[PDB]
Design a protein around this motif. Structure first.
Motif, PDB file in Angstrom:
ATOM      1  N   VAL A 125      -8.099  -3.006   6.776  1.00 16.32           N
ATOM      2  CA  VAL A 125      -6.815  -3.071   7.463  1.00 16.32           C
ATOM      3  C   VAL A 125      -5.681  -3.262   6.461  1.00 16.32           C
ATOM      4  O   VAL A 125      -4.541  -2.866   6.721  1.00 16.32           O
ATOM      5  N   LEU A 126      -5.978  -3.812   5.286  1.00 16.57           N
ATOM      6  CA  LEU A 126      -4.972  -4.159   4.287  1.00 16.57           C
ATOM      7  C   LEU A 126      -5.278  -3.336   3.043  1.00 16.57           C
ATOM      8  O   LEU A 126      -6.010  -3.769   2.151  1.00 16.57           O
ATOM      9  N   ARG A 127      -4.735  -2.120   3.007  1.00 22.93           N
ATOM     10  CA  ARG A 127      -4.944  -1.192   1.905  1.00 22.93           C
ATOM     11  C   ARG A 127      -3.637  -0.482   1.598  1.00 22.93           C
ATOM     12  O   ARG A 127      -3.021   0.102   2.495  1.00 22.93           O
ATOM     13  N   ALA A 128      -3.216  -0.535   0.336  1.00 25.64           N
ATOM     14  CA  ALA A 128      -2.089   0.265  -0.124  1.00 25.64           C
ATOM     15  C   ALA A 128      -2.508   1.321  -1.130  1.00 25.64           C
ATOM     16  O   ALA A 128      -2.350   2.518  -0.854  1.00 25.64           O
ATOM     17  N   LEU A 129      -3.077   0.899  -2.267  1.00 24.07           N
ATOM     18  CA  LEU A 129      -3.708   1.761  -3.274  1.00 24.07           C
ATOM     19  C   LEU A 129      -2.749   2.829  -3.810  1.00 24.07           C
ATOM     20  O   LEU A 129      -2.966   4.033  -3.657  1.00 24.07           O
ATOM     21  N   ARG A 130      -1.665   2.363  -4.435  1.00 24.81           N
ATOM     22  CA  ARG A 130      -0.647   3.259  -4.978  1.00 24.81           C
ATOM     23  C   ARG A 130      -0.497   3.130  -6.489  1.00 24.81           C
ATOM     24  O   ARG A 130      -0.620   4.130  -7.201  1.00 24.81           O
ATOM     25  N   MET A 131      -0.222   1.934  -7.000  1.00 23.17           N
ATOM     26  CA  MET A 131       0.032   1.721  -8.416  1.00 23.17           C
ATOM     27  C   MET A 131      -1.186   1.042  -9.035  1.00 23.17           C
ATOM     28  O   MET A 131      -1.996   0.438  -8.328  1.00 23.17           O
TER      29      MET A 131
END
Lengths: 480, 32, 40, 87, 257, 48, 254
Positions: free
Chosen positions: A77-83
């Motif tokens: 539920v808590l995923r960004a995975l950008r930088m």
């Protein structure tokens, strides 16, 4: 609790970890292959997809309490995975969400909270970078939700999960498609979701919206590139028409649709069954039985799959129709062995010239003959019995009288004995001739094969075909 | 960067169609 | 690997031929020899 | 196609005069010609690699010329040493 | 709007002003609303009752007036109306008569491929009941078995009308095949062979084969022309094409080079 | 939309065109590496 | 259904047929192939004024079959209904074939300037400049400058660089495109001589790139004219610089 409760702690902890590491390493392996060396033809995308068909459907069937399938949605539920620090912050969280679920309990599903398990995992700073990760994590709840078969506010949760995933599929093929190419994954997800979109309808109604959407997805495909996308969307458009009454829409479909010669030996077995069914019903029999054969001898590496049971079922029916005597006892294999009693009893009375038994076999097994789908024998087997007897006589005898054959075929009319053989020569059952003087029905000329170019015509079909086996085997073998 | 890449994909295509040609040609004369 | 279908599930040396059971008419050859002779 | 060794050199030595503007193709075409059977085609490929890339640190040409100086034929070692000196 | 629903249909239809008034009636229904979405809303199902009824009577008018390209045209309008996505609009009794008219017309066109591919939309309406569909599939069964006599003894057996324009095309599509089956290497036969291969005891029909084709009745003897040619001698046509087949082997024993 | 509605009007002409220029180079790389190693087989025979 | 309606001869029934043709053509596939044959023969005699929908759905079915030329011959023959559309998966593929058909025509016509040119439709170039205005209004002029070189047209190239978008940068992106990559030399001077146009009448003397381009061309007398102007305007700062670049780059006979 004393008996089965002791066997409750061993099932979670080790399969929760070892399955998660496989899909994360392959999901990490899909990431590095998407980021670089997009030539992923022999990569683990196929074998992981070969896993998701086999293993996840035969190992787990429910949402797997003590936080195995139910716990993946509060994990993700808590995923960004950008930088690169932002990923490593999430790489800190991957260890933490497994450690709490591995030690203790975190968040439980009670078969109603799918809406907090599908919007906020799609939300909460998610991105468009890891698209097969979002593709698999949306398709992984699709299997136990249908397999539960509970039907208490579940269809609309299926219906929301389909339309969300289909909206995610449009956003990939149109927006930022540069070196992603998830078509090898998104095709079977489109196939498996439409199976559920059909069957859940098939519990209650028909399906028409599924095909008007399918015509649109094939319209927006077929222009880019044909790599098993157009292949799998073709049969879904064709299986439904064969499921209903109409054959004309399938006939115009099979007419003009060229092929990418690439479907990884999984759709070639399926498609050559469907077009063999089509060419059977528009009375093109010789081309039908050879491509019905071609699908059966394609992949015999299946154990009671039902498909190999079904393509074998129609193949003996059509070889009765050509009078080509399908193997009178070879079709009892240990695989099926039970779907032959309506057919071994069938080909028994077809072989002899008996009709009272043949009407008894047909009337007794008529409920079976409608259920399986081959009730197109009712008009096509009265022709076969009356032509089997004249074929056996013309094969045995060489010069028979019309009065002798009329009493042999229990017909009691020497005035249409000329009419039967006239239809036999016209339809090509036997090459003969009738002398309309006193009843002479003579056979052919003396058989000479080896002196009138006939071995050359058989061999020329062999030379050009087996060098084509060689030319296809040369252009597949070398790799770096 | 949508046009500068597009000519570079052609030159990589045209060189490779040459590079597949003469190696395929060399294999005839190397059999001799 | 399902293909979206359904399964339903000497005499035993895995032998036969095309006929092997088709004739059953009187099939003892003591009578068929004997009936032939007396009709002469 | 041709059988004289001199014209085969001057053919494969002419790669550098035509492709010096793009150094990204001269290692792609020498590396398969510098392993031929006769020393002359291996020789002229070695000089073409040096005259294509003038003053760029390649590490790929230097990778290609490293077995070129390790050859039993004497004059193909000579062309490796000059092309190493040019790059 | 509700213009000439049931005019001169029950007794006779000699007039042709009915046809243009029906044509103007076919205009106004299509000028009302299109049948293309066809979702629900029984109000627009009322005008689907009327539109399918005015074409079924238009199909009965078309078969009555000896019109072949219209009878397939009005049927294709009706068969596309039976093709509904959300099929509704409960059972009209003229449906089972209408499919018998289409299927027998399709049997009369010599369409054996189209005959069987239509027979899927009727689940159990072929054996249990529905003699309008049972009569062609009994008839087609008779043509496959080989009994010409059973075809014409059942020719005087029709449920509703006389099937006049359907049996005459059926009479046409058999005899030319019978003429096609007898025009062979046969030289001469007497009248009694045309009494058995063909039919009735000296009608004007044998004059029709005598005025169109040969079969000249002379001294009680017909004369059918016949000959044969001879060709085992040509090794020359398998000389050129075999030389092509041998070279295209040796072309392809190399050349991936 | 200054960029939204125009993504399928002028930029789509390039991005839907480079994919054919990308896959054929990717496909013939399988074909180019076939012909090179076949040449490396026969060249290893003739030298020996 | 629609096949039955197109067998009759009222234009009020033709309108109701084409309304059903362009509506469900994504569903009604090559079943309509017999009906399109009746559209094509009746296309020669227009008679009524609804031939635009007839040419529209003729392209719609030929795209589904895969015919590309006849889809484009009836795209041009359609007219205003074809031009007004710009938001479809269908409309974007056929203009991509049209620019492809246009750019393989001009490069074919570039080899013959001396007569015998092919006749050019106004409707195919009616959507070329229409898409150019879409390229101007999108404000992404790298998209505009890419087609402007592939079309072999010079005044649309001059119009982009004259625009006040990114005047040194986009122009230097254009020179870097032509200096690095080029295969044909027939229009190389034509692109080169239209670059030196915009340096003259822009605002300011910047006589370093014109002398750089005239070294790339053969203009002995045109360099000597502007070097006399540098001395005449009392500008010996860059004139001292540019003669060294002329010495360093060009070697002999210039």
């Amino acid at each position: 609790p004393p008996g089965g409760g002791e066997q409750e702690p061993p099932p979670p902890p080790a399969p929760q970890d070892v399955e998660m590491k496989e899909e994360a390493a392959t999901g990490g392996g899909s990431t590095g292959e998407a980021d670089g060396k997009t030539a992923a033809a022999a990569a683990e995308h196929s074998q992981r997809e070969l896993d998701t068909v086999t293993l996840e459907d035969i190992k787990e069937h429910v949402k797997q309490l003590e936080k195995a399938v139910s716990g993946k949605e509060p994990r993700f539920v808590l995923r960004a995975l950008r930088m690169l620090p932002s990923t490593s912050r999430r790489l800190n969280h991957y260890v933490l969400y497994k450690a709490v679920q591995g030690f203790f309990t975190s968040n439980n599903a009670t078969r109603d909270f799918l809406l907090p398990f599908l919007e906020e995992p799609m939300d909460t700073e998610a991105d468009l970078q890891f698209r097969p990760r979002t593709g698999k994590a949306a398709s992984t709840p699709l299997l136990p939700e249908v397999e539960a078969y509970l039907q208490l506010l579940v269809v609309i949760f299926m219906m929301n999960s389909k339309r969300y995933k289909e909206a995610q599929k449009i956003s990939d093929d149109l927006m930022q498609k540069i070196s992603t190419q998830n078509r090898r994954a998104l095709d079977l997800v489109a196939a498996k979701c439409y199976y559920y979109h059909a069957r859940v309808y098939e519990f209650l109604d028909k399906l028409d919206v599924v095909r008007s959407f399918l015509h649109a997805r094939l319209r927006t495909a077929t222009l880019r590139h044909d790599a098993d996308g157009q292949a799998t969307l073709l049969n879904l458009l064709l299986r439904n028409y064969l499921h209903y009454s109409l054959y004309d829409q399938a006939e115009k479909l099979v007419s003009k649709s060229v092929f990418p010669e690439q479907a990884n030996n999984n759709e070639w077995a399926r498609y050559l069954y469907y077009t063999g069914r089509i060419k059977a019903i528009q009375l093109e029999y010789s081309e039908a039985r050879r491509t019905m054969t071609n699908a059966l001898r394609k992949a015999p590496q299946h154990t009671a799959v039902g498909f190999k049971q079904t393509v074998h079922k129609l193949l003996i029916v059509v070889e009765l129709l050509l009078g080509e005597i399908p193997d009178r006892l070879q079709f009892r294999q240990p695989s099926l062995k039970r779907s032959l009693m309506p057919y071994f009893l069938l080909t028994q009375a077809v072989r002899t010239g008996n009709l009272a038994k043949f009407n008894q076999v047909l009337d007794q097994f008529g409920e079976k003959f409608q259920a399986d789908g081959t009730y197109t024998l009712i008009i096509r087997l009265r022709h076969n019995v009356i032509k089997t007897g004249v074929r056996m006589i013309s094969l045995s005898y060489s010069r028979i009288s019309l009065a002798d054959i009329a009493q042999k075929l229990q017909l009691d009319s020497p005035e249409d004995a000329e009419f039967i053989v006239a239809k036999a020569i016209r339809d090509g059952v036997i090459e003969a001739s009738i002398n309309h003087e006193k009843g002479y029905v003579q056979s052919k000329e003396m058989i000479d094969i080896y002196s009138t170019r006939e071995p050359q015509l058989a061999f020329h079909q062999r030379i050009s075909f087996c060098l084509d086996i060689h030319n296809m085997s040369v252009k597949a073998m070398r790799f770096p | 960067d949508l046009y500068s890449r597009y000519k570079k994909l052609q030159q990589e295509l045209e060189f490779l169609e040459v590079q597949e040609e003469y190696i395929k040609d060399e294999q005839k004369n190397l059999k001799k | 690997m399902s293909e979206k279908k359904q399964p339903v599930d000497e005499d035993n040396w895995d032998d036969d031929n095309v006929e092997d059971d088709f004739s059953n008419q009187l099939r003892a050859e003591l009578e068929k020899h004997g009936y032939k002779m007396e009709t002469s | 196609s041709d059988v004289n060794d001199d014209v085969r050199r001057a053919a494969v030595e002419s790669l550098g005069f035509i492709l010096f503007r793009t150094p990204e193709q001269c290692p792609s075409v020498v590396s398969l010609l510098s392993e031929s059977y006769n020393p002359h085609v291996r020789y002229g490929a070695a000089m073409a690699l040096g005259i294509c890339c003038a003053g760029t640190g390649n590490k790929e040409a230097i990778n290609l010329l490293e077995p070129m100086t390790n050859d039993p034929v004497n004059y193909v070692r000579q062309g490796a040493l000059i092309a190493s000196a040019l790059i | 709007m509700y213009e000439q629903l049931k005019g001169e249909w029950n007794r006779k239809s000699p007039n042709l002003s009915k046809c243009g008034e029906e044509l103007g009636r076919l205009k106004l229904v299509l000028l009302e609303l299109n049948f293309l979405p066809t979702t629900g809303t029984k109000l627009t199902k009322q005008q689907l009752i009327l539109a399918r009824d005015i074409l079924e009577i238009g199909a009965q008018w078309s078969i009555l007036r000896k019109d072949i390209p219209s009878f397939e045209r009005y049927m294709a309008q009706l068969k596309c109306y039976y093709f509904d996505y959300k099929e509704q609009l409960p059972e009209s009794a003229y449906m089972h008569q209408l499919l018998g008219l289409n299927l027998l017309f399709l049997l009369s066109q010599n369409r054996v491929a189209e005959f069987h591919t239509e027979l899927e939309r009727l689940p159990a309406k072929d054996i249990q009941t529905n003699v309008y569909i049972k009569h062609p599939v009994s008839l087609e069964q008779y043509l496959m078995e080989g009994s010409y006599n059973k075809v014409f003894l059942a020719k005087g057996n029709i449920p509703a009308e006389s099937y006049t324009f359907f049996i005459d095309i059926l009479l046409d599509t058999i005899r030319d095949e019978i003429a096609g089956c007898i025009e062979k290497a046969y030289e001469k036969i007497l009248f009694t062979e045309a009494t058995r291969i063909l039919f009735f005891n000296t009608p004007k029909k044998m004059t029709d084969y005598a005025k169109k084709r040969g079969w000249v009745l002379g001294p009680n003897n017909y004369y059918s022309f016949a000959s044969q040619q001879q060709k085992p001698e040509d090794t020359t046509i398998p000389s050129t094409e075999l030389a092509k087949q041998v070279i295209e082997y040796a072309r392809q024993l190399e050349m991936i080079v | 939309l200054e960029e939204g509605k125009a993504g399928s009007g002028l930029r789509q002409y390039y991005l839907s065109k480079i994919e054919e220029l990308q896959l054929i180079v990717n496909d013939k790389s399988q074909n180019l590496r076939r012909l090179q190693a076949q040449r490396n087989e026969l060249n290893a025979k003739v030298r020996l | 259904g629609i096949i039955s309606l197109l067998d009759e001869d009222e234009p009020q029934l033709k309108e109701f047929a084409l309304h059903k043709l362009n509506a469900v053509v994504n569903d009604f596939w090559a079943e309509i192939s017999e009906s399109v044959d009746k559209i094509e023969v009746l296309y020669e005699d227009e008679g009524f004024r609804s031939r635009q929908f007839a040419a529209l759905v003729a392209s719609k079915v030929f795209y589904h079959l895969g015919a590309f030329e006849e889809s484009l011959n009836y795209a041009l023959g359609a007219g205003d209904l074809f031009n007004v559309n710009d938001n479809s998966e269908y409309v974007e593929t056929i203009i991509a074939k049209c620019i492809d058909h246009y750019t393989k025509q001009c490069v074919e016509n570039a080899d013959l300037p001396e007569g015998e040119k092919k006749p050019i439709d106004q409707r195919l170039e009616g959507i070329v400049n229409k898409m150019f205005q879409r390229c101007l209004d999108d404000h992404k002029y790298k998209q505009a400058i890419g087609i402007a070189l592939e079309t072999r047209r010079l005044d649309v190239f001059e119009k982009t660089i004259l625009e006040s978008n990114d005047v040194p940068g986009m122009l230097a992106y254009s020179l870097k495109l032509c200096m690095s990559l080029m295969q044909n030399k027939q229009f190389r001077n034509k692109v080169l001589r239209v670059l030196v146009k915009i340096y003259m009448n822009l605002e300011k003397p910047d006589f370093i790139n014109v002398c750089q381009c005239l070294i790339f061309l053969d203009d002995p007398q045109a360099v000597s004219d502007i070097l006399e102007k540098l001395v005449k305007e009392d500008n010996l700062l860059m004139a001292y610089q540019i003669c060294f670049d002329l010495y360093e780059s060009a070697s002999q006979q210039f």
